[PDB]
Amino acid sequence: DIQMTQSPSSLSASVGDRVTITCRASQSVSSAVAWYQQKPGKAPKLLIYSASSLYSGVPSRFSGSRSGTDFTLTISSLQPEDFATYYCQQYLYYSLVTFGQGTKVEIKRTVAAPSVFIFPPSDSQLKSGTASVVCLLNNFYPREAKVQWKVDNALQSGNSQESVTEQDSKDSTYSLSSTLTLSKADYEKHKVYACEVTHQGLSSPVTKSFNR
Amino acid sequence: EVQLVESGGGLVQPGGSLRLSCAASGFNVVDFSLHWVRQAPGKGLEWVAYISSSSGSTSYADSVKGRFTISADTSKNTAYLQMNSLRAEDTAVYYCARWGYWPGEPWWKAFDYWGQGTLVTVSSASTKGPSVFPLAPSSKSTSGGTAALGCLVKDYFPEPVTVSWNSGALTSGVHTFPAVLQSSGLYSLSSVVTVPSSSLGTQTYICNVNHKPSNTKVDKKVEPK
Amino acid sequence: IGFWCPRHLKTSGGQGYKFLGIDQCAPPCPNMYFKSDELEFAKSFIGTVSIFCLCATLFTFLTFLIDVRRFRYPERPIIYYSVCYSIVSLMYFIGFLLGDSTACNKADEKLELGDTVVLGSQNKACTVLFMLLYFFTMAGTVWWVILTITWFLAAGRKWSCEAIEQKAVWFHAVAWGTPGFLTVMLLAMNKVEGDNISGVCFVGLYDLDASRYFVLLPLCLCVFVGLSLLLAGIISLNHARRQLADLEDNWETLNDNLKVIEKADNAAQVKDALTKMRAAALDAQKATMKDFRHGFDILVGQIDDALKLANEGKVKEAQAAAEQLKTTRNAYIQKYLERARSTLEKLKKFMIRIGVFSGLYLVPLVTLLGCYVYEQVNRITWEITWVSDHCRQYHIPCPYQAKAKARPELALFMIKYLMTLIVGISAVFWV
Amino acid sequence: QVQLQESGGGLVQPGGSLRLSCAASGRTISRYAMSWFRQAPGKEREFVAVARRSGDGAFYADSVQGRFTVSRDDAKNTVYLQMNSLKPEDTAVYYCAIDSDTFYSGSYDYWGQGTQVTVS
């Protein structure tokens, strides 16, 4: 019932920069909010309690603020270990626990244009009755990148599934893969399959196609 | 040192039952309130239930009210939380948390110590081995420079599976995408490499995929077209 | 050549400050800046002003003595402020009555006129007029500073009446001692001078060093510390007032949430009202002797019990548990609320009174300080046009560089003498 | 029905500094984003910088990091590009585009004209 809104759902700061996270409550909850840190694959760890107090064990770079109904977690010094998802929790009663959407903190770097490759389905797939075509990106930093599947200028929807990796340890890059699945008789329609990718680092969409 | 451990995670049928146990070593269950926080894969944390062993103060979330149940005892120093009529949206990881009692600092401290967490999954289909299909790059697809090679494994269950190139001989430029759920309830995984030129090193690449529940060791051979 | 003093107007007596630089020069008993008729008008003007300022300051001195008590120590420095300006108003009355008898001596007849202003403390009946005017003027300023100290102590540090009263010996040591330390310095290097507009001796009239360091500087220092403590007091009470305001808002939402529960039904809105009351109780407890927050702890514990019994589907029992909060609410926290409604009673009664008293004392003083800095920036020019305008009758002094014309305005000096007395009638609005 | 105008440019000496502006008209700016582009002879349509809506993100390319700073003024509906260390090899027409996608995918529809920059 007490909805919590966390607008900056993805922050991007370089090592040594300033990170601020803002949390807003629907009701005028008292100074009882909690800030957590969850590394990928591990349990969350408490950072700030009572909306201003600092937990024992965590470094002193974390700060907790409250001015009215607004709550702010600020990390002035960004160490390489402070790369995790931070969650906002109000706690007024035991049964009124509501978490925020959470903010992802990722390494800021330069913008790289993705490289687009398309692979035709294998000969073993047509013998199984299901044909699958894949179009993948490679080495692009801003995660926001969309693809569309065009079969002779036909805008498909609902038959494409996307998967994106976590940030690479070496060059801080993502990689997106889009899978389109068709049946045997459906794969025989038209002559070409094309995937176009639109990105902020790409001035114009890049189209890769193959004939059938 | 006080710790919280969870047990009972695994694979269950939709609409079935499952029991989860959170054992608290050190502090007793009567001096603290044990909560349960659920995190869907790729989503945020959400609150499920809590128990207070002092008097009995069970409560649940609105989405699970009248469907879940929770219990705790002091003799074994653990908390039990049962499943009734599990739906597909309940597949997540469940964390066991500790919250103090009013008044004073223990209440003002939120969930301080969290458990490891056990992953639960609904099993609408039986386990089956992966089917691996190769991704041969085109002959004109960047001939002479960097090229992308990969192999596709599809229709496998359950989640944990691994992929190795030449029994782990390849490390540079290897990307393994996260697994995704298809419309049939099965998993599909993509793993690709970037081998520049030389006709992919003019040697036959292999994807050794290992699926322990299906005890399969199918090794696919990929060749350029 | 340089500067010169004529053979006429020669002292040969109790040397003091050197007029216009040269030794043994001195000013005349006729001031000769506003000569002839209007000098005597200023004599009657001072006597006219001194009557009204005597009738508004000595009138208070006999008025505070009717009660003596019942004006606490955060009312006290004004009774000694008006006593200090009771003397100051009366010395200007002494100057009007005497005229030009002991404000300057006619000396002997060895020279032409012999009428010259006394300088230094070599002659009696003038250093006394310096002792009681300057010491009780600097005291009157620092007692106002003490009043701003007491206001800041009683509104910023939340000190009680008796805690400040314990420091009464310390305040009297400074307020009678700091002007007392200065009034014994001036006697050491005899920088006391005479006067002709009002026949009372004072310091800094005919010098640029005495007025700037020992008159202009201490009032400006006392004003600066006075406004600093007054501005610190007004901002500390403004913030106190905000705590009482939002605590009263929390009490109001507690009260009307209890009202809306006590006349409603169903198990839906009772949880929503209990949520708001729990938030309000936590806010009021953290707003913030230990018994009050203990009562808040019991209050929010009963809110927790009501929430526990309301989440189980019970309405009438939850209603009884909700109405049970009054018994622990009236006897624990409401007494402190009435205490804050009896001691914060209201400092606006003092805030208005200090605001009016400082308001009607500062703007005459700033105007008085405005003429002091107007005197300081032009006295050198004023002396050099005086010696050039009257270079005909005497033996001609400094024909070189005698090109300056800036006649002083008479509408500025009687304002300075006015604002020196209007500062003392600001205590009649307190009583 | 939305037009975009840009300012700045002209013949500038090597090592100089410029402040290029990009102002739109007929459409709000508080929700959209803009991208600085670059068209040069030989290699065409490269990317420079992005300022999202409120300074929540400033993203630069491999060649323009550090020396390019973007400031945003939503009240005037204009962003500014800061030139620094002007290497005269950058004889290119700087370009500004509007981000027509609310999820920052980079859907770039309205084009405008752009401003040319010639160095030495």
DSSP string, B167-199: TTT--TTEEEPPPEE-TTS-EEEEEEEE--SHH
Question: Are C331 and C294 in contact, with CB atoms under 8 Å apart?
Answer: no
Q: Is B126 left (phi over 0), alpha (psi -120 to 50) or beta?
A: beta
Burial B198-219 (b: 16+ CB within 10 A, else e): eebeeeebbbbbbbeebeeeee
CA distance B165 to chain A (A): 19
Residues 6+ apart with CB under 8 A from A163: A176, A177, A179, B177, B178, B179, B180, B190
Separation between Cα atoms, residue B64 and residue C119, nearest integer Å: 99
Assign D101 to helix, strand or coil: coil
**Of C219, C4, C227, C194, residue with least CA distance to C99:** C194
Which CATH number covers residue B105?
A: 2.60.40.10
Question: D3-99 maps to which CATH number?
Answer: 2.60.40.10
Residues D66, C354: Cα–Cα separation, whole Å: 58
CATH H superfamily, domain C19-233+365-425:
Rhodopsin 7-helix transmembrane proteins (1.20.1070.10)
Q: How far is CA C200 from the centre of its chain?
A: 24
- Who's near A185: CB < 8 A, 6+ residues apart? none
In D, minimum Cα distance to A108 occurs at D59
Proportion of chain C in helix, strand, coil states, percent, rounded to 5:
65, 0, 35
Q: Residue C19 gets which letter from DSSP?
A: G
What is the number of other CB atoms lying within 10 angstroms of the CB of residue A83?
Answer: 17
| Domain end residue (candidates: B98, B122, B146) | B122
- Is B190 within 8 Å of chain A by CB? yes
C215 close to C207: Cβ distance less than 8 angstroms = no
Sheet strand arrangement including A130-136:
A117-119, A130-136, A176-183, A160-164
Q: Do A95 and C286 touch (CB under 8 A)?
A: no
How far, in Å, CA of A21 to CA of C81, rounded? 56
Asked whether residue B136 falls in the same domain as residue B218, the answer is yes
Indicate which of B70, B102, B107 best probes the interface with C, i.e. most C CBs within 10 Å of its own CB: B102
Paired tokens of C21: 């630089």
Rounded Cα distance between C97 and D75, Å, is 73
DSSP C212: I
Cα–Cα distance between D37 and D9 in angstroms, integer? Answer: 14
Please judge whether B103 and C311 are an interchain contact, meaning their C-beta atoms are less than 8 angstroms apart: no
Tokens of C212: 């700037």
Supply the range of the domain harboring residue B154: 131-222
The verdict on a CB contact (< 8 Å) between C301 and B103 is: yes
Detail the DSSP E strand segments found in C195-324. Answer: 202-203
Q: Are residues B110 and B135 in the same domain?
A: no
Domain boundary among B122, B143, B160: B122
**C339 is written with which tokens?**
């205490």
Residues B105 and B191 in one domain: no
| CB contact set of A140 (below 8 Å; sequence gap of 6+) | A112, A113, A114, A173, A174, A175, A176, A199, A201
Does residue B200 come out as left (phi exceeding 0), alpha (psi in the -120 to 50 range) or beta?
A: left
D40 in contact with A, Cβ within 8 Å? no
**What kind and span of H or E run contains B81?**
strand B78-82
Residue C399: asked if its preceding bond is cis (omega within 30°), the reply is no
CA distance C273 to chain B (A): 19
Task: Report angle CA C180, C182, C183 to the nearest 5 degrees.
Answer: 65
Give C391-396 contacts, CB < 8 A, sequence gap 24+: C394/C6, C394/C8, C395/C4, C395/C6, C395/C7
Cβ neighbours around C338 below 10 Å, total: 10
- Of the candidates C236, C69, C84, the residue with the CA atom closest to the CA atom of residue C165: C69
User: Which residues of B, range 85-104, sit inside 8 Å of C by Cβ?
Assistant: 102-103
Q: How far is C294 from chain B (nearest CA, A)?
A: 10
Q: Which helix (H) or strand (E) holds B122?
A: strand B118-122
Placement of tokens 């009607």 in the chain: C360
> In angstroms, rounded to a whole number, what is the distance separating the alpha carbons of residues C130 and C218?
17
Count of CB atoms situated within 10 Å of the CB of A60:
8
- Helix, strand, or coil here: C167? coil
Continuous segment of H or E residues that includes residue C136: helix C127-155
- B102·C308 Cβ contact <8 A: no
Closest CA to C42 of C92, C83, C76: C92
CB D74, CB D30: distance < 8 Å: yes
- Paired tokens of C412: 């500025």
Residue A165 structure tokens = 């990796």
In this complex, the residue of D46, D47, D104 whose CB is nearest that of residue A144 is D104
B210 forms beta bridges with B162
- For residue B135, the tally of other CB atoms under 10 A from its CB is 23
CA gap B27, B52 in Å, rounded: 14
- Residues forming a β-bridge with B59: B50
- Residues of chain B neighbouring A91 (CB-CB closer than 8 A): 99, 110
Question: Which D-chain residues 42-71 have CB contacts (< 8 A) with chain A?
Answer: 45-47, 50, 56-57, 59-62, 65
Residues B35 and B52 in one domain: yes
**b/e map C266-293, b = 16+ CB within 10 Å:** eeeebbebbbbbbbbbbbbbeeeeeebb
- Identity of the residue in A1, A27, A95 whose CB atom sits nearest the CB atom of C279: A27
Asked if A39 reaches chain D (Cβ–Cβ under 8 Å), the answer is: no
Which residue, among B69, B74, B46, has the nearest Cα to B59 in the 3D structure? B69
Chain C residues whose CB is inside 8 A of the A29 CB are 279
Contacts of C305 (CB under 8 A, 6+ apart): C321
The two beta strands, B118-122 and B10-12, are parallel
Q: What is the DSSP letter of C326?
A: H
Answer for the pair D96, D85: CB distance below 8 angstroms, yes or no: no
Which residue in A27, A30, A95 is closest to C282 by CB distance? A30
Neighbours of A11 (CB within 10 A): 19
Structure tokens at B50: 């809590």
Q: What is the C-alpha to C-alpha distance for residues C386 and C379, in angstroms, rounded to an integer?
A: 11
Q: HEC profile for D31-58?
A: CCEEEEEEECCCCCCEEEEEECCCCCCE
> Are B95 and A44 a contacting pair at CB < 8 A?
yes
Buried b (16+ CB within 10 A) or exposed e, C183-222: beebeeebbbbbbbbbbbbbbbbbbeebbeebbbebbeeb
Sequence-separated (6 or more) residues with CB below 8 Å from residue C154: C74, C161, C164, C347, C350
In chain B, what residues touch A53 (CB-CB under 8 Å)?
108
Domain count, chain B: 2
Phi–psi pair at C355, nearest 5 degrees: -65, -45
Give the C-alpha separation, C60 to C424, whole Å: 11
B57 CB neighbours in chain C (<8 A) are 308
How far apart are the C-alpha atoms of A28 and B98, rounded to whole Å?
25
Find how far residue C387's CA is from the centre of its chain.
39
**What's the rounded Cα separation, in Å, for the pair D93 and D38?**
6
Q: Does residue A163 sit at the C interface (CB-CB below 8 Å)?
A: no
Q: Which amino acid is at A21?
A: I
Among B122, B141, B175, the domain-final residue is B122
Location of structure tokens 């290119």: D92
Q: With beta carbons less than 8 A apart as the criterion, state whether A196 and A202 touch.
A: no
- Say if the Cβ atoms of B59 and C311 lie within 8 Å: yes
Q: Are C79 and C144 in contact (CB under 8 A)?
A: no
Residue B30 DSSP label: T
Angle between helices C77-98 and C410-422 (to 10 degrees): 140
As a whole number of angstroms, the distance between CA C409 and CA C429 comes to 32
Report d(CA C88, CA C425) in Å as an integer. 11
> Which among D55, D77, D83 has a CA at the least distance from the CA of D5?
D77
- A106-109 LR contacts (CB < 8 Å, sep 24+): A106/A10, A106/A11, A106/A12, A106/A167, A106/A172, A107/A12, A107/A14, A107/A15, A107/A83, A107/A167, A107/A172, A108/A12, A108/A13, A108/A14, A108/A17, A109/A14, A109/A141, A109/A171, A109/A172
Q: Which CATH architecture has domain C241-343?
A: Up-down Bundle (1.20)
Q: State the amino acid at position C340 in one-letter form.
A: A
Strand partners, D49: D36, D60
Distinct helix (H) and strand (E) counts, chain D: 0, 10
Residues B159, B113, single domain; the answer is no
B117 and A CB contact within 8 Å:
yes
Supply the angle between the helices C127-155 and C77-98 in degrees, to the nearest 10. Answer: 160
Residue B179 CB neighbours (<10 A): 16
Shared domain check, B115 and B13: yes
Sheet holding A4-5, edge to edge: A4-5, A19-25, A70-75, A62-67
The partner residue sitting opposite A31, judged by closest CB among C275, C286, C307, is: C286
In this structure, the strands spanning A103-107 and A85-90 are: antiparallel
Count of CA atoms in the C-beta half-sphere (13 A) of A23: 32
Domains (range + CATH), chain A:
4-107 (2.60.40.10), 117-211 (2.60.40.10)
CA A107 – CA A130 distance, rounded (Å): 40
Q: Which residue of A has its CA nearest to C311?
A: A95
Q: Do B138 and B200 fall within a single domain? A: yes
The phi-psi region of residue C398 (left if phi > 0; otherwise alpha if psi is between -120 and 50; otherwise beta) is left
- State which residue of chain C sits closest to A31, comparing Cα positions: C283
